[PDB]
Amino acid sequence: DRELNEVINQMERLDGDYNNTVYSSEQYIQELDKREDMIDQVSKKLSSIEASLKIKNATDLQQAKLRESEISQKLTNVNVKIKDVQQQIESNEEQRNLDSATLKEIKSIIEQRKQKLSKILPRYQELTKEEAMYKLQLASLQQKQRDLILKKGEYARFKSKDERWIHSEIEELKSSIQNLNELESQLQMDRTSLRKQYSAIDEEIEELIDSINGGQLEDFDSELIHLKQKLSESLDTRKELWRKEQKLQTVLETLLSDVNQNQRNVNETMSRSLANGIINVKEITEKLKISPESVFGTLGELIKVNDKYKTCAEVIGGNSLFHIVVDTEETATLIMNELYRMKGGRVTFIPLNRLSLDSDVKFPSNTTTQIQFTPLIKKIKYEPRFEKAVKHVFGKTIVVKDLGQGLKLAKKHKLNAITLDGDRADKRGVLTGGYLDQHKRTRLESLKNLNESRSQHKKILEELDFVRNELNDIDTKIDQVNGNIRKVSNDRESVLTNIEVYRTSLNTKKNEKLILEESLNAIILKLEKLNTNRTFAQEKLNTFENDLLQSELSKEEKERLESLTKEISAAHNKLNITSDALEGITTTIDSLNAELESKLIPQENDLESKMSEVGDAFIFGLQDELKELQLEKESVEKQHENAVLELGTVQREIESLIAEETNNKKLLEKANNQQRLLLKKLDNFQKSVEKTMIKKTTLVTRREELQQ
Amino acid sequence: QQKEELTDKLSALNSEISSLKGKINNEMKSLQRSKSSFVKESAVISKQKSKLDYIFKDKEKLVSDLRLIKVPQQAAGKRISHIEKRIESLQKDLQRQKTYVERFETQLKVVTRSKEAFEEEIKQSARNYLNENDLKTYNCLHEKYLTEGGSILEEKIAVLNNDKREIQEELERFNKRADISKRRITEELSITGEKLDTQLNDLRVSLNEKNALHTERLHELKKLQSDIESANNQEYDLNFKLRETLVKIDDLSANQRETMKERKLRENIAMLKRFFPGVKGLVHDLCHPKKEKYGLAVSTILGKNFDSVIVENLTVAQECIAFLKKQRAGTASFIPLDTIETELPTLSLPDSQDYILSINAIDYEPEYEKAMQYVCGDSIICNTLNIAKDLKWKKGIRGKLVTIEGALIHKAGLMTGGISGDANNRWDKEEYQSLMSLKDKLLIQIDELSNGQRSNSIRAREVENSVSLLNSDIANLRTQVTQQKRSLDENRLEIKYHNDLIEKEIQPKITELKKKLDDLENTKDNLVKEKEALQNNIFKEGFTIKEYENHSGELMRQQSKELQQLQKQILTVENKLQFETDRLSTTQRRYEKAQKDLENAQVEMKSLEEQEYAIEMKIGSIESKLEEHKNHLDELQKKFVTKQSELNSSEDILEDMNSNLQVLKRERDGIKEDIEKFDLERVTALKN
C-alpha cells in the first residue's frame, strides 16, 4: 500500500507549484507596489504643490489686487499730471494770445506816443523859441513896468519940496526898517540854518531807512523751500513704508493661518489621551509661574536625526517623542496637582534637578563584525546638556542589518535592536514589526514647520516694530516741518511788519522833508527879495541922502521925469504888442502841447501797466514751461514704470493660472491611476489569500494522510 | 456522515441566493451610478457655461467701473475749469461794476467841464464886446491924479503884490490838495482790489473749513466703521474658536475611525490564528478587571503589551511579519512562547507593606500567568499620591510603581500623571454638515477680513488727505493773516492821508479868508480910484480902456489862460472817456471770452452728463444681467449640491454592496471550498 505515499508526493509537488505561483505573484505585486509608491510620492508632491498653489492664489491674489490698485493709482496720478500739463498749456496759450494782442496794442500805443513825442520835439523847437522871447519880454516888463512904477514914485517924492530935511527921517526908515530886514535876515539865518539842519536830519533818516530796505529774507525762504521738499520726500517714503508694512502684515497673517492649519494637521494624528495632556500642560504653563523657562517642550523639537534612518527613530521613539523635561521635580508635582479637575490624559515629566539612574553605557563597536551595527547616538544633533535623558531614550537602541543577528547580540548584550527597514526588537525578549505606510511621526517633520512659523512670526513682529518706529519718525518729521514752516512764516511776518512800518515812516518823513524843502526854497526866495530890497534902498534912499547932503530945483529932475513918461508910454506899447504876440503863439501851440501831454499821461500809465503785466506774464510763462517739462518727464517715467508693473503682474497671474490648471489635471490623472492600482492590488491580495488558504488546506490534508 | 454534506449544500444554496440578490442590487447601483455620472457631467457643463457668462459679466462691470473712474477724473477737471470760469465771471462782474461807477463819475466830470467851458466862453464874449487933444488933456489929468493919490496908488500896488503872493500860495495849496486827492483815489482803487481779494480769500477759507469739517466727519465715520469691523472680527474669532471645537469633535470621530482600524488589525491576527497553530490573541480579555479597584491602573502600566499578541514560536512571529508585508495588513507586537523562558523564575512574594501586587489581581492559566508576570516585572499599586511618595522616595529602590488613580513613577524615575473623562461620540454624518457649515463661516469671515483690510487702506488714504487738507488750511490761514495785515496798513495810510488833507484844507480856509480880505481891500482901493476919476471928470468928457494896453490886455491874457486851462480840462475829460472806452473794450473782450468759456463749460457738462447717463444705463443693464446670472448660478449650485449628496449616498450604497459581495465571496471560498474538501474526504474514506 504505497498509493498514499504517491498522493502525498503529488500534494507536495502541488504545494511547490503553488509556492512558485505565489513567488511570481509576489514579484508582480512588488512591481505594482513600486509603481504605487512612485504614484503616491508623485501624489503627495502634487498635493503639496496644489496646497502651495492655492495659498499663493489667495495671498498673491490679494497682493496682485493691491498691485493693480497701485498701478491704477499711478495711472490716475499720471492722468492728473497730464490734465495739469494740459491746463498749463492752455494757460500758456492764453498768455501767448494775450501777449500777441496786448503787444499789437502796445505797439500801436507806442507808435502814437512816439508820433506825439516827435511832434512835441518839434513843438519844443517851437515852444523853446516862444519861451525865450516870452521870458525876455516878461523880464523887460519887470524891468520896465516895475521900473515905470518906481519912476512914478520917485517923481511923486521929488514933487514935495521944502526950502527949510525929511531925508534924515527916511534915513531912519533906511536904517531901522533895513535893520528890521536884518532881523528878518536873522529870521533867514534862524530859518536857513534851521532848514539846513532839517535837511541834514532828513538825509540821515533816509540813509537809515535805505539801509534797512536792503538778503536774509531770501535765505529764509530758500531754507523753508528746502525743508518743504525734505518733508515731501519724507512723506513719500512714509507712504512707501506704509504699503510695505501692509503687505508684510497680510503675508504674515497668511503664514500664521498656514501654521495654525499645520498644527491642527499634526494634532490630528496623536491620540487624544495625550493631545489633551499637551493642551492642559500648555495653558497651565502660561498660567502658573514658569519664569525660569523650566518647560522644555516635547522631545522631538529638542533633537534632530539624520533622515537616512529617521523612520527607525520614530518607530523606536513613539510616545517618547512627547517627553517633557523640567528643571525641578517639585515644579512637575505642583503642575500635576494643579490638573485638579483633570480634563486631559497622559503627560510625563523628567526632572533635571534629580535626573539620575542614567547608568553608564559602553558600546562594543570597538571590535570587528559591528559594521552592520550602527549606534544611533552617532546620527543625532542635540543639546549636549541633556545627554543622559537622550541616552535613556535613544541610547541602547541599536541598528542591525539582520533580525537574527540583532537577536543574537541582544542576548549577548542587553540592548534594543531594530533594522533600517523597521523591524523593532526588544532586549527583554519581545519582538515587534509590521508594514509601515508613508504616514509617520509627522510631528518631527511638522516641528520644522512650526519652527519656520515661529521665525516668520518673529520677523513679522520685528517688521511691525520697524513700521511703528518709521511712523513715529514720520510724525516727528512732519511736526518739525510744520514748526519750521510756522517759525519761518512768523519771522517773515515780523520782517514784513518792520519793513512796512519803516516804509510808512519813510513816506511820512519824505513828505515832511519835501514840505521842508519847499519852505526852504520859499525862504531862499524871500531872502533874495530882501537882499534886492536892501540894495534898492541903499541905491535910492542912500543915494538921495548922499546927493542932497552936499536947491529946491528939478530941472534935470524934470527932464528925467519927461524921459520916464516917454519910456513908460513906449513900454506900455511894447508890452501890448508882446502880450498880443505871446498870447497868439500860446493859443496856437501850447493848447496842442498840453493836449499831447495829457494824452501821454494816461497813455504813459497804460503803457506802464501793460509793461508790468507783460513782465509778470513772461516770468510766469518761463516758470510754467519749466514745471511742465519736469511734470512731463515725471509722467513719462511713471507711465513706463506702471506699464512694466502691469505686464509683470499679468504674466505672473497667467503663469499661476496655467500652473493651477496643469496641477489639477495631473492630480485627476494621478487619482485615476491610483484607483486602478488599488483595485489591482486588492485583486492580487485576494488571490494571494485564496492561494494561502488552499495551501493550508493541502498541508492539513497531507498531515492527516501521513498520520497513518 | 451525509448530514454534514446536506448542511453544506443548504448553506451553499442560501449563499447562492444571497449572491444573486447582491448581484441584482449591484447592477441596479451601477446603473444609478452611470445615470448620476451623466447628470454630473451635464451639471459641470452648465456650471462651466455659467462661470464663463459670469466672467464676461464681471469683465464688462470692471470696464464700466474703470470708465466711470476715468469719468471721476474728467469730472474733477471740469469742476476745476468751472470754478475758474466762475471766478473769472465774478471778477468780470466786479470789474463791470467799478468801471460803470468810474464811467458815471467821468461822464459827470465831463459834463461839468463842458458847462464850465461854455460859461467861460460866454463870459469872454460878454467881456469882448483916447485921441490927440484928448491925450493932451489926459497928460494934465494923470499928473493931477498922481499928485493927489500917489499914496493911494502905492498902497494899491502893494495890495496887488500881496494878492499875487497869496494867489501863488493858493495855487500851491490847490496843487498839493489835488495830489493828495489823486493819491487817495489810487489808494481807494487799491483798497477795492484788496477787498475783492480778501473776500475771495474769505470765501475760499470758508469752503476749505466746510471741506475740512466734511472730511473730519467722513474720517470719524470711517474710524467708527473700522471699530465696528474690529468688533465683528473679534466676535467672528470667538465664533471660529467655537467652530474649531466642532472641528475638534470631527477629529475625535476620525480618532474613533482610527480605533476601528486598530480593531481591524486584530481580526486579521485572528485570521492568522485560523491559519497558524496555537495562537492566543490579545491580552485585553486575558485579565481580571472585576472589583472596580485599580482596574484601569494595570492597563495603563501594561499598555505597551496591553495591545500585543501572544504566539507560539519566534519563527511563527517572523512568518507572521512576512505575511503582514505580503498582504499589507498592519503592525503589532508579538510575544512567542519559545522566548518567554528568560524570566519565568521571578515568582517571589516578598514583603508588600500590606499592599496589593499586580499578579494578585489578574485571572490566568499557567502560561498566561507566566506571560503577565514577565511583562509586569516589579509593578506595584498604591492608594494615594502621598502614600506612593512615602513608599517610593523614602526608599532606595526604584521601580515601576503606580497609584490607584494612574500616577506612576518609571523604573528610571519618570514621575507621571493624567486622567481623562471620555465622551463616546458618533454623528460623523451630522459632522459632515457641521464641518461644511464651519468652512462656509470661515470663508465668510475671510471675506469680511479682506473687506476690513480694504476699509483700513481707504481710511489711511483719507487720513493722508486730511493731513494735506490741514496743511492747505494752515497755508490759507497764513495768506489770510498777510491779507489782513496789508488791509490794516492800507487803512492806516488812508487815515494818514485823510488827516493830512484835512490839515491842508484848514490851511486853505485861512488862505481863502486872507484872499477875501485882500479882495475887499482892493475893492476899496478901486472905489477910491473911481472917486478920483469922477472928480477928474469935472474937466473930462475911457481911461480904463485907454490903458487896455495894460489893464484889459492883462485881463484878456488871464482869460486866455483860463480858456487854455478849460481846454486842458476838456482834453483830460476826453482822455478819461478814452480810458473808459478802452476799459469797455477790455470788458467786451472779457464778455466774449466768458461767453466762449460758458459755451465750452456747457458742452463739457453736456458731454459729462451724457457719459454719466450711458455709464449708469450700462451699469444698470449689467447689474440686471448679473443678478439674473447669479440667481441662475445659485439654482445650479443648489442642484449640484443635491447631485453631490445623491452621488455620495450612491457611493456609500455601492461600498456597502461591495462589502457584502466580498463577504459572500469569502464565505463561498470558505464554504464551497469546504464542501469540496468534505467531498474529497468522503471519497478518500470510500477508498477503504
Numbering used by the authors:
A (entry chain B): 236 to 399, 402 to 451, 456 to 791, 795 to 952
B (entry chain A): 247 to 375, 380 to 791, 797 to 943
What does the published report state?
Cohesin is composed of two rod-shaped SMC proteins, Smc1 and Smc3, with a dimerisation interface at one end that is connected to an ABC-like ATPase domain via a 50-nm-long coiled coil. Interaction via their dimerisation domains produces a V-shaped Smc1/3 heterodimer whose two arms are connected by a central ‘hinge’ domain.
We present here a cryo-EM structure of the apo form of cohesin that reveals the structure of folded and zipped-up coils in unprecedented detail and shows that Scc2 can associate with Smc1’s ATPase head even when it is fully disengaged from that of Smc3. The resolution of the folded coiled coils and hinge (5–6 Å) not only permitted the identification of the contacts involved in folding but also allowed identification of candidates for cysteine substitution for potential bismaleimidoethane (BMOE) crosslinking to assay folding. A 5.5 Å structure of cohesin’s coiled coils in a folded state enabled us to identify a pair of residues within the Smc1 hinge/Smc3 coiled coil interface, namely Smc1R578 and Smc3V933, whose substitution by cysteine led to efficient crosslinking by BMOE inside cells, demonstrating that folding takes place frequently in vivo.
